[PDB]
C-alpha cells in the first residue's frame, strides 16, 4: 500500500522559532480534482490524536494560523510558526486517498530551553513493603534539562546494577523539563544486611554527581 515516510523522528525547537516536518508518499494522493486527502495530526502526551490540517493546507476549526501545511507531488510539509510550549507532542501525517489508510511514523517536537539540574529525592522501603519480604528503594530526579541523565545506585559504597527499573516522563508542557524515577528492588533479607543507600546522578549541568543518601539505622 501507500508508504508515508515522515522526517525527522525528533525535532528540537526554541520558543518563537518555526518547526518544519516532512512526509513523502510512495504515490500521488490526488483523489479527484480539488481533493488531496493528506491530513496532519498532533498527539499530546496521554491523549488521542487531534486533527490540525486536512486536505493538505486547510486549518481545522480551532487551530491557530501558526500552523500551516503545503504539498507538491508526493512531498508534504507541516510548518509550526511561533512555537509555544503547549505545541509539544508527536505529529503524524496520514493519507485517506487510498484504502488501506496509512500513517507516517511520527515526529516528536521537543522544546528547547535553558539547562536545569535535577531535583533529587531518595526514599527508603516502606514498613508495609518490608512486612512482605521485599524492599524497594526509590529515587526521583525531577524537572531537569536536557533529557540525557545517568543514575547510579550504590549500597555501602558499591555500585549495584541488578534489580533496577527506570521510567521517564514525557517533556512537560509548561516548564519544558523531563523527570525520571528509578526503583532498586532487593529482598528484605539483603536490604537489612547493608547500611548506606545512595542514589547518584550525573547530568550535563554538573561536573560532580548529585548524591542523595540514607543510612538504615538513622531512620
Amino acid at each position: 500500500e501507500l508508504v508515508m515516510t515522515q522526517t525527522p523522528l525528533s525535532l528540537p525547537v526554541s520558543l518563537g522559532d518555526q518547526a518544519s516536518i516532512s512526509c513523502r508518499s510512495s504515490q500521488s494522493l490526488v483523489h479527484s480534482y480539488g481533493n488531496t486527502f493528506l491530513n496532519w495530526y498532533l498527539q499530546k502526551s496521554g491523549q488521542s490524536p487531534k486533527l490540525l490540517i486536512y486536505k493538505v493546507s486547510n486549518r481545522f476549526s480551532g487551530v491557530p494560523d501558526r500552523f500551516s501545511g503545503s504539498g507538491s507531488g508526493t512531498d508534504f510539509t507541516l510548518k509550526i510558526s511561533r512555537v509555544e510550549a503547549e505545541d509539544l507532542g508527536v505529529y503524524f501525517c496520514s493519507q485517506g486517498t487510498h484504502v488501506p489508510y496509512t500513517f507516517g511514523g511520527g515526529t516528536k517536537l521537543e522544546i528547547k530551553r535553558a539547562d536545569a539540574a535535577p531535583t533529587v529525592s531518595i526514599f527508603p522501603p516502606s514498613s508495609e513493603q518490608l512486612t512482605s519480604g521485599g524492599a524497594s528503594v526509590v529515587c526521583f530526579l525531577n524537572n531537569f534539562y536536557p533529557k540525557d541523565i545517568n543514575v547510579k545506585w550504590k549500597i555501602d559504597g558499591s555500585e549495584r546494577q541488578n534489580g533496577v527499573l527506570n521510567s521517564w516522563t514525557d517533556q512537560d508542557s509548561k516548564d519544558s523539563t523531563y523527570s525520571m524515577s528509578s526503583t532498586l528492588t532487593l529482598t528484605k533479607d539483603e536490604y537489612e544486611r547493608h547500611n548506606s543507600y545512595t542514589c547518584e546522578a550525573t547530568h550535563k549541568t554538573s561536573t560532580s554527581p548529585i548524591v542523595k543518601s540514607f543510612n538504615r539505622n538513622e531512620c
Partner: protein
C-alpha cells in the same frame, strides 16, 4: 462538542475473542463513515477497519492483517460502532480508537486498551514514599507512591482525589516478568506537609482493587 467513547477493552488470552463498542454524540452518527485504528510502540498507528453508510449497503473494508478475523458493524439507531475481534494474537495488543470523519473533519475517541496475553491478572501493592527523617530541609518537600507488581494496564492514580495536580509527576509503568510497576511523586511547600494530609489514591479495575495510601512522616 463532538464526543466519541470506546469501551470493551481488557486482558484476553491469545486465540480468545473480544467485542469493542464505540458510542458517538455531538453529531449525526448515521451521516458519516467510521473506522477503527490501533496504536502500539512496535507499529505506531495502524488503520484496522472502515464501515460506510446505509446508502453504501454498509460496505466495509479491512486491513489485510485482520481480514476475516475482525468484524466492524454499526447501529445508527443507538449511534454505536462495534468491533468484533476473534483469534487474537499477542501482536493485536494496543490502544484501539474509533474515529468519525468526512471531507472537512476527523474526530477520535479516547481509546480502549486491549492486552492479548497468557499472563494472569494481578493486583498492585501500593506503598507510601515518605522522605528520610530530618527537620524540613528546603522550602519544598517531595513525597511519592509506588504501585508495584500489577497486570494488566491500566491503573488510575491521583493525589487527594485530583485536587493536587501541580507539582505531580506520574511515571509511565515499566513491564518486566509479566508485571507492571509505576510510581508518582508530588512536591509541595515544606509548610504544607506533614501538617496537611497527602494521600495517594490508586485503582486497578482489572483486579477490582482500590487503595488510598496516606503519606505519614517517618
Amino acid at each position: 462538542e463532538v464526543k466519541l467513547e470506546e469501551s470493551g477493552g481488557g486482558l484476553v488470552q491469545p486465540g480468545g475473542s473480544m467485542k469493542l463498542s464505540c458510542v458517538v454524540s455531538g453529531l449525526t452518527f448515521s451521516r458519516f463513515w467510521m473506522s477503527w485504528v490501533r496504536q502500539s510502540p512496535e507499529k505506531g498507528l495502524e488503520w484496522v477497519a472502515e464501515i460506510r453508510l446505509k446508502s453504501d449497503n454498509y460496505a466495509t473494508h479491512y486491513a489485510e492483517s485482520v481480514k476475516g478475523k475482525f468484524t466492524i458493524s454499526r447501529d445508527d439507531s443507538k449511534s454505536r460502532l462495534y468491533l468484533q475481534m476473534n483469534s487474537l494474537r499477542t501482536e493485536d495488543t494496543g490502544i484501539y480508537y474509533c474515529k468519525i470523519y468526512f471531507y472537512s473533519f476527523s474526530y477520535w475517541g479516547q481509546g480502549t486498551l486491549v492486552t492479548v496475553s497468557a499472563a494472569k491478572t494481578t493486583a498492585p501493592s501500593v506503598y507510601p514514599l515518605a522522605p528520610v527523617c530530618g527537620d524540613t530541609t528546603g522550602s519544598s518537600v517531595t513525597l511519592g507512591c509506588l504501585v508495584k507488581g500489577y497486570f494488566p494496564e491500566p491503573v488510575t492514580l491521583t493525589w487527594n482525589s485530583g485536587s493536587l495536580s501541580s507539582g505531580v509527576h506520574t511515571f509511565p509503568a515499566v513491564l518486566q516478568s509479566d508485571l507492571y510497576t509505576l510510581s508518582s511523586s508530588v512536591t509541595v511547600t515544606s509548610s504544607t506537609w506533614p501538617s496537611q494530609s497527602i494521600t495517594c489514591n490508586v485503582a486497578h479495575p482489572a483486579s477490582s482493587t482500590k487503595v488510598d495510601k496516606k503519606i505519614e512522616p517517618r
